[PDB]
A paper describes a structure:
Sirtuins are an evolutionarily conserved family of NAD+-dependent protein deacetylases, with seven isoforms, Sirt1-7, in mammals. Sirt1 features the conserved Sirtuin catalytic core of ~270 amino acids, which consists of a large NAD+-binding Rossmann fold subdomain and a small, structurally more variable Zn2+-binding subdomain. The binding site for the acetyllysine-containing protein substrate is a cleft between these two subdomains, which undergo a closure movement upon binding of substrate and/or NAD+ cosubstrate. A biochemical characterization of the interaction including binding and stability assays, NMR spectroscopy, mass spectrometry, and a crystal structure of Sirtuin/[name] peptide complex reveal that [name] acts as a competitive inhibitor, through binding to the Sirt1 substrate peptide site.
We can conclude, however, that the key elements for Sirt1 inhibition by [name] are present in the generic Sirtuin catalytic core that is shared by all isoforms, and that we can thus exploit other isoforms as model systems for structural and mechanistic studies on its interaction with [name]. We solved a crystal structure of [name] in complex with a peptide [name] 62-71 at 3.27 Å resolution. The structure was refined to Rcryst/Rfree values of 20.2/26.1%. The electron density revealed the Arg-Lys-Arg motif of the peptide ligand to be bound to the substrate binding groove, with [name] Lys65 in the active site pocket for the substrate acetyl-lysine, packed between His248 and Phe180/294. Arg66 is stacked upon Phe294, and Arg64 interacts with the mainchain oxygen of Leu298. Beyond these three [name] residues, the ligand is not well defined by electron density and appears to be flexible, without major contact with the Sirtuin. Comparing the complex to other Sirtuin/peptide complexes ([name]/ACS2, Sirt5/IDH2, Sirt1/p53) confirms that both types of ligands share the more closed Sirtuin conformation generally observed for Sirtuin/substrate complexes and the high conservation of residues interacting with the visible core motif of the respective ligand. The comparison indicates only subtle differences in the local Sirtuin conformation (small rotations of [name] His248 and Phe294), likely caused by the Lys acylation of substrate peptides. The only significant difference between the [name] motif and a substrate appears to be the side-chain position of [name]-Arg66, which appears to occupy the pocket normally accommodating the backbone of one or two additional defined residues and thereby supports [name] binding and its ability to compete with physiological substrates.
Author numbering: 121 to 394
The structure:
Amino acid sequence: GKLSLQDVAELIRARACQRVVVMVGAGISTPSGIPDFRSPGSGLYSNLQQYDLPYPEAIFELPFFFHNPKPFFTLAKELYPGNYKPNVTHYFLRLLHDKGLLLRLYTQNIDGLERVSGIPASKLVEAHGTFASATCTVCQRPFPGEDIRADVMADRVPRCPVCTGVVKPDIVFFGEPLPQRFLLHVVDFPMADLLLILGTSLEVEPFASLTEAVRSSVPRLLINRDLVGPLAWHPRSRDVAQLGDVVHGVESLVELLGWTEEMRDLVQRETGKL
Ligand SMILES: [Zn+2]
């Protein structure tokens, strides 16, 4: 006796699941046009070859930042809040929160679109960082993202007002440790009664183990093109796959919840405010 997408949809309507924990990846955002800087062809990829990086991933290396910050900041300009807007996927999660069901949303994305869709900070774990804030590389003072917005959009490298050091946005670089809020997972996953995995393979650790971190009786809804990861290898009876386009699978569950109108309604107000 498996479950189906409607099954879950009805567990949320009946509110037999009311402490939902969601995990999202790159897949929920490419609908909003977030360009993969890794993939050639995208505009951002083009601008990055202009420099002397040995590979695209070296923007996220501290060495090949303090050597030249400009490559990173080229990404920074492209992703900096406002330039893109959230899609139906983020908004389902916005809604899921407003309806009081959202325990925590753990994201691997840096587009901060979870923020913009209107989910409060307390609900978010931006495990790979955010452009929302920054920190002086030298004097360690933090800065709200607006202060470096001026220099960033104008291709200048923002130096600190007190000491003139580089003000690096709070993006997690390879090698630096994951943000402190990631450690909420000790309490969130044991209290989660529903796990929701959208648009990512959960292949990189330590997120891969988190999927097995809900109690056994908890259903895990996956919505992704493929079926891989700890959901493929070690599945559970309570699991539900929704393979294919994420946007579509999101809409199908918004339907089966009967929210499809309330969703179009949210999409209305929040598109105007942007
Ligand atoms: Zn400083």
